[PDB]
Amino acid sequence: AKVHGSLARAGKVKSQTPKVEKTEKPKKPKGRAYKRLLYTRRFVNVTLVNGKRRMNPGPS
């Protein structure tokens, strides 16, 4: 069907969303030590057990 519609609005949403810049953070380990932080975090010390186990909850 129509092929010649408007084009002006091209790149609208990105170009109008407030550029909020990142926040400086602790350098996470790069490699085995990361797999270790993952091991202890996932399993060793454990976290919540509210029914089951949540891997990324916000205001839960």
Binding site: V3, G5, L7, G11, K12, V13
Partner: protein, 144 residues
Amino acid sequence: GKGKPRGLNSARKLRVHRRNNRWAENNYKKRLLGTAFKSSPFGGSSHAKGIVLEKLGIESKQPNSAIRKCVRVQLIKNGKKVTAFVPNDGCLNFVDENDEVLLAGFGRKGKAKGDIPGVRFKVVKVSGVSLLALWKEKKEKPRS
């Protein structure tokens, strides 16, 4: 025993029959006839480079409503005109008419992607510096 011959000599009838009924096997057909080279905008190659003609905004299909930004591209090696899509938000701003772009397929063996009727190819590299890099802000568009 319905159908196929079972004798110890029927080898011929069997392999022949296999050829025959292989011809209904789509993929086989296309691979054999060589639709690959005769038809198809690209040579059979993964991608192909062409030149930008019109900048078209195609109204998407149903049940959907939008304006899919695209580019009329005439393949260099081919001269075949073919209309492709410029992915990501923005990007149509990056391309401009009379430009030299690298085109790739839309992963479906031909067949237009989603709500975009006709368009069977997406864009990858304007003026030789990759859409993504620009749309982020790594590289910057070449001089001319």
